[PDB]
Design a protein around this ligand. Structure first.
Ligand code: GLU
Ligand code: GLU
Ligand code: GLU
Ligand code: GLU
Lengths: 414, 415, 414, 415
């Protein structure tokens, strides 16, 4: 008369959590979580008796090669260890053909997860950065031209030789002194020269004012670096390594996806030399955190958004997710339990209690309000590294400067 | 053949479009599009003819208030006006209850679209913008008087008037270099003149500082542009506006959902006035183009990402997909052809023709060059264009002095 | 009552709002008195017809002195012209004298409302602001001393005295030109003088850099700053007049209040010139908007909030609530209706419908919601009025400069 | 008769406090405070004898839900161990059904409480703080090296060393003025020297700009601090924690009210651990005092206004009151004292004796009132202290140069 069933589940942290009294409790009491209280609600509607169990394989597990003999979690259904599965498991025809599935309870998709980027060590020459590259070339050519035009106009028969000191060497010297805003030893006596002298002042005044303003702007609200826009970039580059969780349905999806980017990524991962795949969520997390972002991990975004709130907040989503897929309850073929739980799942889908479960197990567990910069940093003094460049230039210049005197003296040695 | 199957259709690119000269063509040949091809695939695989018909009221339709009447294509299905529905009809519970669907053939999410904001190429002389015309003009007038007074004071009968170099031209040349803080070759000696020098120096000290400060502040403000992202801002931002197509089941979803984000959205849309809703997709996207920044629009991501690649290329997606849905071919309740249709759908799926048709229709029409993809977010770099004008001023200045020196020669050679 | 009642009500937008078709709507269907038809729960139980009736005097009503005449609402209740009032009216013993009350449905208090402040025109001399009076003073004494010390040490006996240009006049000239960062031809050429020269350069360098930095910060962020915040300021009031609603029981409360700050306020409000009070909401509103900078108005915080979200969004709450009191139903003494309606108000408080009663009007009409610092209009060009001071100084100095030459000329006339 | 009625009370300032000589005094004189004073007016109106008694567990108490056994003062009132109680217990319906109350004698508001923000005392040389110690150090060495190289290269024979003025001391004088951008009297002649000059010029041009930019940034970040205001954003801020007294009426209010912001507050108060709850006002205040900046507390505003006026003055109100409440004297149901007590309360209210008590217990007690008035420090201006040290450096510099001339005299005076 009486009847009981065995249930399969998995200790996924968003879905099932190990109760502190884990030493001796039964699976119907050992556990709490979205799967646990979903199962309780299902048994409340359908009335059937059950016991919770972990997946005996403790994993999703891969298909047996060349046979597709099922993994632990599916085999426990097919071979009578269990008759119902309530787990975060991907809906697909390659599974629907062997076992029945309920209506999906959630809709979700693949995402990348990456280490949150951090401030890099500043560049040795980064003191140039505000003013952009090309302008320095324009400045150089302008200085040349200005010196030449000054020299010519100064000496093009002002009525004559020796009438003033403006030699070409001295003309370059005047041109250089006028820029860095320093002592002026001489001045153009002639109108055309005073004219040439004039505009160069306005030009330097504007340039310097712009530079000093912009550098001041730069030091406020840094808001920099964004190394990857989407997996597009990850498909163009090859330095950063990546891979899926092993045995995952992502691997089968890529195995047959005809999209050129995804087909290229698949053929690479098939061709990848090191061990790109990870067996566990913990391994996938640790590998990225170890790699300082040099390796990136693919997972269903609903795990990422759970880990995102579990401090430290050193991980982030990027990209607009990969696809859309359902999660649902599963049932082996011919099992009488199938439709009486499927109708209960339909009830919950239309009654909306799942929104209560989602609130209870994700949104109430949000912690990391640091996303919105809830606390304001304080500026600190410049490090020596932020200006180090100028000292090398200085000392090198002095070193060169000594050499000239010796070579001049050796020329004048006879 | 028993009878030609009555097909309901609505004009929507790329699903269905009018032919270039449709008025010249056969009634079915009048139309072209993704679904028109698929209709031929259905006719092939199931082995019967079909008749294309435009949906009379031009909408999917919804349940009428307080009457439970059905209008739109669904109305035509529930009242037996047609035999099969061929349109990007989304599958939802409140309609599944009365019409039958094949296996889904495509998956989608909802998306948000906005106008591309600007083309901010700086003006040729915009570096002057901190000071405005009047300040420069008054500086110009002020410049003269200082020299004039210096000259007048410098030259008088010492009751020895030759004992100073402050001629008129030198009295100019002193003052310009003084204003630029470049120093001088000579310094005034009379008590009167030093006062003038002092006040002109003070004037300089104020002006140059003010200019530098203002330019710095201006760039500082520009750094904080902080554009809207991820639609989360629409929980709090209200300077923007947004809305949806009318009679779309998007509206039913929004008014039926209770998720606090989307509850807030429906609360806004239920109460904001004047009506943010729109009756047609064509004028809806035009509403964004007309609103030019103030009104955003919500639509299926498939449509957003079709449109945004079209020739004008003046709009873009923002944020990710809000949810997930799918299309299915639909037919009245108990239509015996429905299972043959489901088999045809399954075979066309397995054959990959669902890619074939999409690969024809989407990628060739991707005529926008997709430049300025945002892959280099300014990097705070001060572009050369922003300062270009000064180089023209410099070159012109140098160009003039040649001609000056030439006429100076022509003078010195005959005076 | 004759199985029929005329509910005393007042048209006030936080509680009752006229329907558009008031030319043809009649009875309760002329309005949306959700603020009443819940408390009418006992009217539902008794089944008597209730008409939402406009208070005859259109005002909260009052009680006279001497004659003790009862006005408006109060009059029509005590004279038996009306029978039940659900009007938003203040609980006070002066009314408990002749009528009785239910438990108050909500609590509120005295509030004060002013026109939102605005940026005035810039000050003529406001260009001085970054350094303040003390520093601007001290610079002068520093300049004096530096010149004096230079003159002293430069004219120790060289061995013949006055072997260099550094007279006192020239010393003042040199030190002034050194302050302004200007070309000075003469040089100390002496140890003590060079020492003195150095420090003055370092001093000016620091001063100027500080000034420019601070002004740069000043232009980035603006804050209007409210001129007053407290009742103490209103006791120290300069010109801004203030007053309560006329005929309002807050006025009698102020007449009753003995506490020294409020007694001083009252004795001012007694001794202020006539027309300091206002009789209606609209009169107070217009007076405040007319008072660009001359008057401030006091009202109940719930009405302040109800206005604060309306258009134009040009008013603000200032300060805290001055007191607290309840609003509740009022009825003639010992009424066979007034007794049981308290049961309705009680159990409606247990049901918590007060939250809906608030939300439907105060929060659904939030309208002019949050404004913050996120994005602003371009700072735009600096106006001439922000620097006008310098031009006056300049032209004044030039005008003076000629005078010295004429008097010098007349001195050298013999 | 009257068997020496027992009054229950809990110690709290200014309500009731111990006498400083309670180690040796006896009777009700062992105490001071608002309520124990008012007890004399109660005895005046009742005509009865009474004794003060300390509440054993020292708290108001709670229903103890899932058990429904009252404790605290309410416990003593329901189990008949307390004849009458006088304490700042607020009247609530969940209490009124257990105990009687007089007319309310005083009105209250709930308040938030925080530590004072520490005053930003300037440093004597804080003007240096933008530029870091190592840079200031290394500038000196670079200045030395440049000067030495300029000297050496200038005076090596030109083929004769008398041909130029660049002596060692003159070489030190050139470089200093060049670094300060003050110009100079003389200019280097040889190509090597001009190279050195240009290098040193570029170096200063970089340094001075960097210094100015950093100082401007440093002030800018400061300005926009925007401290917490009205404290309602404790519903939104999370870096700063806030507490509430155990068993207090507030502990019910946040469970029992259902306004959304207070809902998320109660969710915080439920979830946060170490718990927000505290057993005593004294140690909660101590917790705030030690947990400066990061911690806050909820209390009756009347208590904050008592506490914040004490000599330490390190704490203050923030924001407006949360609600409105009152206090009444309490007694078991149907006590024949109740109506006499209500009459006494009414009389004392009408007589204004409430103020005659209150004035002694707050207005003489206030001993901190220093607030910005007449003028305000915070507006924009820099204080003199913020740059003060430079003036000391200047004065000392001028003070030194006298002695140089004095030793120059002491040399020359015996040539
Ligand atoms: N292990 C999950 C997810 C794997 C994946 O993301 O592909 C499943 O196969 O159902
Ligand atoms: N017509 C679709 C929505 C189309 C859209 O919002 O883009 C529906 O029934 O929901
Ligand atoms: N609502 C107040 C009138 C306004 C006032 O007192 O200022 C009353 O019930 O009397
Ligand atoms: N004395 C108040 C304390 C209120 C509180 O702090 O929660 C009471 O009766 O509970």
């Amino acid at each position: 008369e009486q009847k009981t069933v065995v249930v399969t589940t998995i200790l996924e942290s968003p879905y099932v959590m190990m109760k502190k009294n884990h030493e001796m409790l039964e699976g119907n009491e050992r556990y709490e979580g979205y799967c646990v209280d979903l199962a309780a609600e299902i048994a409340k509607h359908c009335g059937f008796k059950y016991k919770l169990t972990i997946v005996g394989d403790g994993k999703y597990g891969a298909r047996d090669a060349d046979t597709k003999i099922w993994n632990g979690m599916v085999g426990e259904l097919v071979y009578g260890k269990a008759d119902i599965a309530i787990a975060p498991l991907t809906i697909t025809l390659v599974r629907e053909e062997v076992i029945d599935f309920s209506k999906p309870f959630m809709s979700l998709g693949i995402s990348i997860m990456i280490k949150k980027p951090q401030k890099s060590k500043p560049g040795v020459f980064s003191f140039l950065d505000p003013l952009a590259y090309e302008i320095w070339m324009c400045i150089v050519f302008a200085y040349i031209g200005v010196s030449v035009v000054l020299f010519l106009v100064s000496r093009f028969s002002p009525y004559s030789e020796s009438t003033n000191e403006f030699g070409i060497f001295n003309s370059l010297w005047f041109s250089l002194g006028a820029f860095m805003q320093q002592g002026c030893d001489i001045s153009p006596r002639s109108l055309s020269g005073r004219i040439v002298g004039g505009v160069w002042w306005f030009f330097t005044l504007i340039i310097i004012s712009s530079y000093t303003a912009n550098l001041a702007a730069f030091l406020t609200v840094e808001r920099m670096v964004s190394p990857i826009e989407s997996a597009e970039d990850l498909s163009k580059q090859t330095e950063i390594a990546y891979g899926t969780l092993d045995s995952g349905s992502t691997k089968e999806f890529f195995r047959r996806s005809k999209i050129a980017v995804f087909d290229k990524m698949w053929t690479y991962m098939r061709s990848a030399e090191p061990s790109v795949f990870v067996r566990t969520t913990a391994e996938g997390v640790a590998r990225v955190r170890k790699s300082k972002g040099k390796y990136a991990y693919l997972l269903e975004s609903t795990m990422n958004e759970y880990i995102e709130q579990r401090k430290p907040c050193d991980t982030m989503k990027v990209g607009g997710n990969l696809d859309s897929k359902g999660y649902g309850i599963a049932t082996p073929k011919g099992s009488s339990l199938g439709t009486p739980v499927n109708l209960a799942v339909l009830k919950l889908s239309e009654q909306g209690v799942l929104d209560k479960l989602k609130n209870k197990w994700w949104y109430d567990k949000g912690e990391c309000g640091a996303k919105d910069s809830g606390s304001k940093e304080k500026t600190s003094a410049l490090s020596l590294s932020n200006v180090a460049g100028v000292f090398y230039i200085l000392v090198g210049g002095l070193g060169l400067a000594m050499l000239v005197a010796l070579i001049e003296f050796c020329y004048k040695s006879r």
